[PDB]
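Why this split exists: single-chain examples teach little about how molecules sit against one another. For that reason, every record in the complexes split bundles all components of an assembly together and asks for one structure covering all of them. Below is a record exactly as it appears in the raw files.
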Amino acid sequence: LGPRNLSCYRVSKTDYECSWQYDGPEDNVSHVLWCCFVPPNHTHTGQERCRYFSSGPDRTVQFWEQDGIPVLSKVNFWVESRLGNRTMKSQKISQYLYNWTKTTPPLGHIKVSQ
Amino acid sequence: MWELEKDVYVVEVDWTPDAPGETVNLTCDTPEEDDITWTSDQRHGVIGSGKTLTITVKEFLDAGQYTCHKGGETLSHSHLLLHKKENGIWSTEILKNFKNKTFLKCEAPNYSGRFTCSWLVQRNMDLKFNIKSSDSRAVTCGMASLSAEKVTLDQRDYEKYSVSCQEDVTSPTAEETLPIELALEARQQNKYENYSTSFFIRDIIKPDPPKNLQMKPLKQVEVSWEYPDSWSTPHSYFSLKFFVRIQGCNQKGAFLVEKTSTEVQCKGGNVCVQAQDRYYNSSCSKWACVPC
Ligand SMILES: *[C@@H]1O[C@H](CO)[C@@H](O[C@@H]2O[C@H](CO)[C@@H](O[C@@H]3O[C@H](CO)[C@@H](O)[C@H](O[C@H]4O[C@H](CO)[C@@H](O)[C@H](O)[C@@H]4O)[C@@H]3O)[C@H](O)[C@H]2NC(C)=O)[C@H](O)[C@H]1NC(C)=O
Ligand SMILES: *[C@@H]1O[C@H](CO)[C@@H](O)[C@H](O)[C@H]1NC(C)=O
């Protein structure tokens, strides 16, 4: 139960999109798409910056290259679904955006173990 | 980084993650010497101190307006714009191309040097446009009189901007060796692009439709017309040809007519005429139509 299969990708030269599915009853459910990232700067402290989209009942989010989310650096995304006062979070994805398309497979990408 | 206008700078960026951003310095235009703070319209709080702020610019969150302050008073501003270069191709996304895959469509009603150049955009927010002729047939365009109208293409809405231009040194009777070269600079929020175009007046010509279309029947119909007053003179040199039909030139059921006189039979419908430069395959005119 909860939000499931989160993916985000490029849909045009400037526009991007995140999509996800939700296992369970869909009535009176609201979703909040979260995005946090560390911007390349001159600060040595991490200084994580976060943005969010409230999409209500819909399970897609549209944005574009000038909305404030980096597309050439690693970003983290997850979905928080609300039913009543319970919030169900999705698993976190960590990816670039510029080289992802609607057909890019969500699994099978290399990850660095540190 | 190069300067576009006063305190407006363009930063060219490669649209790859591996490319480190362009390290650049922004100096505050002010006589003050101490306690200078820097802010950005995309970050919260002070982002640096001193009269000079050094930042690395890679993508759009690093662009925008940078402001220096002293004790709550703004000292100066500096706008950072990005010109995207992705896979070796300078960005062409602010504008939407026409049916023939061009971005700048120019039309001239005559050889006088007057012409109109138009373009299409879909996201009509935070836009700025500047056009200029870049050996050189220089033109001046009345940007101060830029206009736009809503047009629908492929069931999608766009705004068609248009600006009138005029060749500076003109000579209509003479033939053209070098073409006119225009460049439109397009800005959308923090994005910069430019589009180039070269052409001859001969090729962009689209005459006005004929005027005075009077008929005269026979036991057979004889309808005539005459040149539009916007067409170049003398008419003996700037001749026109006509295509007459009865309901890119879109001439499919018409026939070549060189003079204004024409005999025709019409059982029903509307006999329709257009115009075109006789000695060059330029654009044709909007059809003019009279009822049989
Ligand atoms: C369409 O866009 C392209 C790509 O953005 C653009 O090309 C760029 O034009 C600018 C404007 O001239 C170039 O900037 C110059 O680059 C040279 C080479 O290093 C410099 O010497 C120049 O320095 C002058 O300007 C400085 C401040 O701007 C001064 O401090 C200095 O004293 C000089 O006077 C200047 O930086 C830039 O190099 C190109 N980029 C490329 C990749 O070619 C093109 O001009 C645009 N076309 C139109 C018609 O707008
Ligand atoms: C996108 O680019 C990054 C940086 O090179 C790379 O690590 C990642 O695997 C790429 N993703 C895809 C889906 O190609």
